[PDB]
Amino acid sequence: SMLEEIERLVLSGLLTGDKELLKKASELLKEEMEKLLEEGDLDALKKALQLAVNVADHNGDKELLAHAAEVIKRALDLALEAKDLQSAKYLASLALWIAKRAGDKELYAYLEEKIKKIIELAEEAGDRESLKILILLGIFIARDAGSEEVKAFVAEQLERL
Amino acid sequence: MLEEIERLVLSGLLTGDKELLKKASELLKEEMEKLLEEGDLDALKKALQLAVNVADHNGDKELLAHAAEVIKRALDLALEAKDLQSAKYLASLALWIAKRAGDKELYAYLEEKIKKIIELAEEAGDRESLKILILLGIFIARDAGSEEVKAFVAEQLERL
């Protein structure tokens, strides 16, 4: 409900070109993100991070973009302990988008340590279609950043895929 | 088959083999036209995902335009079959290439379809999809400068 109203501000702000509506929506969305982080709401966090990225993609808000990189690190953490393959896949995929758009080396190195666990989550779940996505995500991680222990992990996983 | 085309794109992207990705591009251009003939829209979305992946590394303009061409064909089949989950994927993907390449043709195709595509989401009652679909309409009307579309997404936004 609080998220539905924030979405009502982003949609109207991105329509009328109201730079003040996006400034208020991004500030409320940054605060709302820290709220659902303590509640463990993964489903609503997927929509909040989707709205945050959509705002920063249009107005170039590096502040809201950097804040999204921090909460996506914590939101991806909750998905891994919850063994949620579909949420961990969307979370890590969007994390690469923020890693590529913002050039954050911290979020890139964080993906290097978790890609071994997200891919194993897809292998443990048996979803080969969802695995091919995560295996491709591991290739993009080793391509953009110097991955010494990840490049040999995704390579061996492709043969067994 | 997409299952082996997947194996070539992943191996070429990982080892940097430009000839390997080139070989997948010829197979993708032939597999996409066949996937549209069969009507497999779930598999075509995977081939489209692979097509825009090899093109955004090898710098392919012919295959990317071919992927943008079968997107317009797959969107019509998704509209004739009321496949809301597909039509939302084809349209949202069409905006991806139209934004990075500035293709005025792909943007103009999206103005006429976003009306019938949004109406497909409101008819099914999927409130979680039309909100994504409405956002697709704003970028269509804002980035392409559409006057008749700006009033359409606004009128649908007030009814939310």
Binding site: V53, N54, S93, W97, I133 | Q49, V52, N53, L135
Partner: peptide, 8 residues
């Protein structure tokens, strides 16, 4: 997704 959706 790798890439497409709004975004994902």
């Amino acid at each position: 997704x790798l890439f497409x959706x709004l975004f994902x």
